Design brief:
- This is Cytotoxic linear peptide IsCT.
- Shows weak hemolytic activity and antibacterial activity against both Gram-positive and Gram-negative bacteria probably by forming pores in the cell membrane. IsCT adopts an amphipathic alpha-helical structure.
- The structure is a monomer.
- The chain has 13 residues and is mainly alpha-helical.
- The chain is built from 1 helix and no strands.
- The longest helix is centred in the middle third of the chain and has 11 residues.
- It is elongated and about 20 Å long.
Length: 13
Amino acid sequence: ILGKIWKGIKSLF
């Protein structure tokens, strides 16, 4: 969850 956000948001950029 912690990385899913930082990784899910930076990947959608």
